[PDB]
Amino acid sequence: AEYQNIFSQVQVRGPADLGMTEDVNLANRSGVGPFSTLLGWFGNAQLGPIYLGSLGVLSLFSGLMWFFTIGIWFWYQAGWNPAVFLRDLFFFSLEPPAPEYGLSFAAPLKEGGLWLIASFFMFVAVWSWWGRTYLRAQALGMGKHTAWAFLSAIWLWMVLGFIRPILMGSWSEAVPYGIFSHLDWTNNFSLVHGNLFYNPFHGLSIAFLYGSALLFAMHGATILAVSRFGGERELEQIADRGTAAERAALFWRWTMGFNATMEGIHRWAIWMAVLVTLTGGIGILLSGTVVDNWYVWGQNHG
């Protein structure tokens, strides 16, 4: 093979790039970390710097609180035994309050009360992180494409954990915190709602999930195959179309009868991925609230 380009053959190293300044508060940026030769074979070797901000600190903290709340409960179920803790690590589960308590926050800690506390910390950690992704883009004067795409993922997580259980009138409809347990929750959910496979939004989400692995494999391979013309420098290819962009476009034009541009492909990319969590959230939202059985609902197509 005259041409791998999956891993670099030669690594070069110079002074650390402190990055663009613009309107970011440099006082909240860390120092640069060490260089990683291991990472250097695949991508950049430079580690750091990182930006905090007020939201970032709040996010990490509220995040860490979400773990310990789950962590302590896991230790509790293991009878404070370190061995039994690591034996049943994947079997531990922090479950939501029983149906008895409905939508009340008046559940005791050992009966779903802790789950409510954990979910609260996760809620703050995620949304504060979302604002962080927004503000980092704004501070650099960049577009907000990242936050809006992130918002699609949040939407799915909000439906599963908050929006749908409220509509169902019970917190027990929410997702538990535990490796194996929510897998069982996921399987049981599909069984309860009469085989999810016949949920059209569910099939759509799968189509986009597949399509995401499809599109990127095509795009990633395309860029690498065109790397010999410096095709990975996409932004300058936008401002000034190169022979890199042209050969890449013609390959697909000749393959499938039509093609994309260096910018438009990233619009294809961002929508393909977003539609996964976007459609999925809708499909879950309608399940149990509007439709009890999707197969039966499907056979009448109405």
Partner 1 sequence: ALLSFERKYRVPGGTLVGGNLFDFWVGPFYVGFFGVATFFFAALGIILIAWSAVLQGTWNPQLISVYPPALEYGLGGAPLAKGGLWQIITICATGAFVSWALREVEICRKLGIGYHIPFAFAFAILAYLTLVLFRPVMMGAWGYAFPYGIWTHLDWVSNTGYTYGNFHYNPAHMIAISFFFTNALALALHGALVLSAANPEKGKEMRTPDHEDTFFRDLVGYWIGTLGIHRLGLLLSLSAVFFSALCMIITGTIWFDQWVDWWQWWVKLPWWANIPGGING
Partner 2 sequence: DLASLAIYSFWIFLAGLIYYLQTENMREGYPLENEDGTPAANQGPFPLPKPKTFILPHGRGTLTVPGPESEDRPIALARTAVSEGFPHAPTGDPMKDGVGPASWVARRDLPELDGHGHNKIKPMKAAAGFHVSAGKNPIGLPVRGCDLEIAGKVVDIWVDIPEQMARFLEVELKDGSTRLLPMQMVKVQSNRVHVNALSSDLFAGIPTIKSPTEVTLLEEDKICGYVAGGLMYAAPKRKS
Largest CA distance in the chain: 67
What does the alpha-carbon distance between residue 16 and residue 47 come to, in Å, rounded to a whole number?
9
CB of 138 to partner 1, least distance (A): 7
| Among Fe ion, ligand BCL, ligand BPH, none, partner that 149 touches (CB below 5 to 8 angstroms by kind) | ligand BPH
Q: Which one of 98, 100, 108, 144 is in contact with partner 1 (CB under 8 A)? A: 144
Q: Is 145 in the site for partner 2 (CB under 8 A)?
A: no
Q: Is 205 in the site for ligand BPH (CB under 6 A)?
A: no
Is 301 annotated to bind a ligand? Reply is: no
Integer angstrom CA distances of residue 135 from 69, 112, 139, 152 = 29, 35, 6, 18
Residue positions counted in the chain: 302
| Among partner 2, ligand BPH, ligand BCL, none, partner that 175 touches (CB below 5 to 8 angstroms by kind) | ligand BCL
Token readout for 133 is: 């992704």
| Among Fe ion, partner 2, ligand BPH, none, partner that 229 touches (CB below 5 to 8 angstroms by kind) | partner 2
CB of 215 to Fe ion, least distance (A): 11
Is 234 annotated to bind a ligand? Reply is: yes
What does the alpha-carbon distance between residue 244 and residue 225 come to, in Å, rounded to a whole number?
10
Cα–chain center distance at 85: 28
Q: Which one of 59, 119, 172, 237 is in contact with ligand BPH (CB under 6 A)? A: 59
Taking phi over 0 as left and psi of -120 to 50 as alpha, with beta for the rest, 104 belongs to beta
Q: Is 301 in the site for partner 2 (CB under 8 A)?
A: yes
For the four alpha carbons of 222, 225, 229 and 231, in that order, the dihedral sign comes to: positive
Tokens 């949304």 identify what position?
A: 127
CB of 68 to partner 1, least distance (A): 20
Task: Tell me how far apart the terminal alpha carbons of the chain are, to the nearest angstrom.
Answer: 56
Is 266 annotated to bind a ligand? Reply is: yes
CB of 130 to ligand BCL, least distance (A): 8
Q: Is 273 in the site for ligand BCL (CB under 6 A)?
A: no
User: Between residues 93 and 152, which has the closer beta carbon with respect to ligand BPH?
Assistant: 152
Q: Is 260 in the site for ligand U10 (CB under 6 A)?
A: yes
Q: Is 71 in the site for ligand BPH (CB under 6 A)?
A: yes
Contact range with ligand BCL by CB under 6 A, out of 22-30, 201-209, 216-224, 259-267: 201-209
Q: Which one of 41, 148, 210, 295 is in contact with partner 2 (CB under 8 A)? A: 41
Integer angstrom CA distances of residue 300 from 211, 276, 294, 296, 297 = 29, 26, 10, 7, 6
Is 127 annotated to bind a ligand? Reply is: no
CB pairs under 8 A, 24+ apart, for 9-15?
A: 11/37, 11/40, 11/41, 11/45, 13/40, 13/45
Q: Is 195 in the site for partner 1 (CB under 8 A)?
A: yes
Cα–chain center distance at 97: 27
Q: Is 211 in the site for ligand U10 (CB under 6 A)?
A: yes
What does the alpha-carbon distance between residue 155 and residue 151 come to, in Å, rounded to a whole number?
6
- Interface residues with partner 2 (CB under 8 A) are 2-3, 5, 8-15, 17, 20, 35, 37, 40-41, 44-46, 200-201, 204, 227-230, 233, 236, 238-247, 249, 259-265, 267-268, 271, 279, 282, 286, 290-291, 297, 301-302
